[PDB]
From Swiss-Prot, chain A:
The PIM (PUB-interaction motif) motif mediates interaction with the PUB domain of RNF31. It comes from Homo sapiens (Human). Homohexamer. Forms a ring-shaped particle of 12.5 nm diameter, that displays 6-fold radial symmetry. Part of a ternary complex containing STX5A, NSFL1C and VCP. NSFL1C forms a homotrimer that binds to one end of a VCP homohexamer. The complex binds to membranes enriched in phosphatidylethanolamine-containing lipids and promotes Golgi membrane fusion. Binds to a heterodimer of NPLOC4 and UFD1, binding to this heterodimer inhibits Golgi-membrane fusion. Interaction with VCIP135 leads to dissociation of the complex via ATP hydrolysis by VCP. Changing residue 33 to A: Minor effect on affinity for ATP and ADP. The chain holds residues 21 to 185 of 806 of the full protein. Belongs to the AAA ATPase family. This is Transitional endoplasmic reticulum ATPase. Coiled coil: none annotated. Phosphorylated by tyrosine kinases in response to T-cell antigen receptor activation. Phosphorylated in mitotic cells. ISGylated. It is linked to Inclusion body myopathy with early-onset Paget disease with or without frontotemporal dementia 1: An autosomal dominant disease characterized by disabling muscle weakness clinically resembling to limb girdle muscular dystrophy, osteolytic bone lesions consistent with Paget disease, and premature frontotemporal dementia. Clinical features show incomplete penetrance. It comes from the Eukaryota.
Curated annotation (Swiss-Prot), chain B:
Residues 3-65 are annotated as: UBX-like. Forms a complex composed of CDC48, NPL4, UFD1, DOA1, SHP1 and deubiquitinase OTU1; within the complex interacts with CDC48 and DOA1/UFD3. Hydrolase that can remove conjugated ubiquitin from proteins and may therefore play an important regulatory role at the level of protein turnover by preventing degradation. Participates in the regulation of the ubiquitin conjugation pathway involving CDC48 by hindering multiubiquitination of substrates at the CDC48 chaperone. May be indirectly involved in PIS1 gene expression. It comes from Saccharomyces cerevisiae (strain ATCC 204508 / S288c) (Baker's yeast). It is found in: Cytoplasm; Nucleus. The chain holds residues 2 to 73 of 301 of the full protein. The gene is OTU1. Present with 2770 molecules/cell in log phase SD medium. This is Ubiquitin thioesterase OTU1. The OTU domain mediates the hydrolase activity and the interaction with CDC48.
Length: 157, 65
């Protein structure tokens, strides 16, 4: 019942960088479509995402895909805080490590023209080629998050 | 109501329901080089049309550089 604490719900959109709220809930929070928001889950787990409206989503719920839920260590049904993320800067450089060539196939199409927000310690899944591939963000500059821009250097192990 | 962020400014901006790109640039008291907006994100280079035309609506966020 605190307007900014929302119940974790399933995503329709499988975009890793997006969470969705009902337009009445966004109105109540003075949040704008496309704004960067800061989310908080377990234990100091945090995530930065772009907020979209969804007129099928219940005012009290937040649509967030598996990738974001795992970064927040939450499960469907858990409760989350959303607040605006005041200023995330464009990235100069990020360092990512694949888990078990990656730039051309996966990372570059993933980031190109998307302006995705990213946080140190994120694990993220990229589709392309034969299999999907998960990467971890080891570090970002500025730390601990930034917007991946076209001129952001990508260092991949 | 549009929220507007980048080029050292962060401000909600209110304007005509029918309003036009020019009037938007004028309300922003800053040299604006680019605008980015919507989902998937589209890009505009400002180096004319009714905001309505491109898809911009009320309660939406514009990022400028």
């Amino acid at each position: 019942n605190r307007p900014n604490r929302l119940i974790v719900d399933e995503a329709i959109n499988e975009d890793n960088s997006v969470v969705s709220l009902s337009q009445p809930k966004m109105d109540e929070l003075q949040l704008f479509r496309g704004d960067t928001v800061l989310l908080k889950g377990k234990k100091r787990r945090e995530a930065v995402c772009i907020v979209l409206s969804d007129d099928t989503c219940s005012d009290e719920k937040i649509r967030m895909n598996r990738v974001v839920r795992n970064n927040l260590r939450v499960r469907l049904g858990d409760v989350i805080s959303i607040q605006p993320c005041p200023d995330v800067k464009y990235g100069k450089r990020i360092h990512v490590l694949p888990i078990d060539n990656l730039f051309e196939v996966y990372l570059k199409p993933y980031f190109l023209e998307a302006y995705r927000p990213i946080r140190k310690g994120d694990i993220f899944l990229v589709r392309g080629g034969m299999r999907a591939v998960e990467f971890k963000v080891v570090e970002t500059d500025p730390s601990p998050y930034c917007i991946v821009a076209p001129d952001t250097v990508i260092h991949c192990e | 109501k549009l929220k507007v962020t980048g080029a050292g400014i962060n401000q909600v901006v209110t304007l005509k329901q029918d309003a036009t790109l020019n009037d938007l640039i004028e309300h922003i008291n800053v040299d604006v080089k680019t605008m980015r907006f919507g989902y998937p994100p589209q890009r505009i280079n400002l180096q004319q049309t009714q905001l309505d035309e491109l898809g911009i609506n009320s309660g939406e966020k514009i990022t400028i550089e």
